[model samples]
Target: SYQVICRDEKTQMIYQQHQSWLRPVLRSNRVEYCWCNSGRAQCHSVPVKS
Candidate 1:
């Protein structure tokens, strides 16, 4: 079962790259998780545009 137990599901918001200042454009609500097996994880990011 991989002993997969999701830990603190902290809602890490997304911040786009820009100059001057960071504009609060949209809410992406990035996700992060961990496992007991301590194996590799797939690094992914869902890009969005306005």
Candidate 2:
């Protein structure tokens, strides 16, 4: 399984999750989220980066 690095908006704590798993925080849409090694070789946000 692939893992993603996500942070809690309220607590500001970082944690890992399976790519397909849905978290309440993610569903809340309260934060600008970022993930690590998300199908790419390196860490980046959902919008991508240079």
Candidate 3:
């Protein structure tokens, strides 16, 4: 059940980042979140390659 919750949270985070791009002042913050949904979460940083 914990893994399922993590997915929801991570999905929400991605959605927020996408939304922040629409605004000029809202800067997206990065934090470790579940990426693979492999049950074992890690400190995977969301690096926006410029």
Candidate 4:
């Protein structure tokens, strides 16, 4: 499964979530977000890998 890098606007806390599994957060009014990868690699924003 694919993952995504998302940050809560109110809390400013970075979090990880399954791409398709993210609903109200990622799709909150079709709001802002980003994928959890950096060119097929783990995103630099986060250091963890799966």
Task: For model 2, state the Cα shift of residue 16 in Å.
Answer: 0.6
User: Which residue pairs in candidate 2 have backbone atoms (N, alpha carbon, C) closer than 3 angstroms, thus clashing?
Assistant: none
Model 1: residue 3 alpha-carbon error in angstroms: 1.4
Worst 10 residues of 3 by lDDT: 16-25
Instruction: Give a tens-digit lDDT track for model 2, residues 1-50.
Output: 44456554545655565333222334534434444345322332242243
Residue 47 of model 4 has an lDDT of 22
Q: Write the per-residue lDDT of candidate 1 for residues 1-50, one digit (tens) a residue.
A: 54233232233332222211122323675333222233222233434432
- Candidate 4: misplaced stretches above 4 Å? 1-3, 19-50
Clashes of each: 0, 0, 0, 0
Give lDDT for model 2: 0.41
**Backbone clash total, candidate 3:** 0
Evaluation by TM-score, superior candidate among 1 and 2: 2
Pick the lDDT winner.
Answer: 2
Note the residue pairs that clash in candidate 1: none
Tell how far residue 27 is off in model 1, in angstroms: 9.0
Question: Candidate 2 regions off by >4 Å?
Answer: 1-3, 19-50
lDDT of 3 by residue, 1-50 (tens): 23322223433433321122121122565533333334333334554544
RMSD of each: 13.0, 9.0, 8.4, 12.4
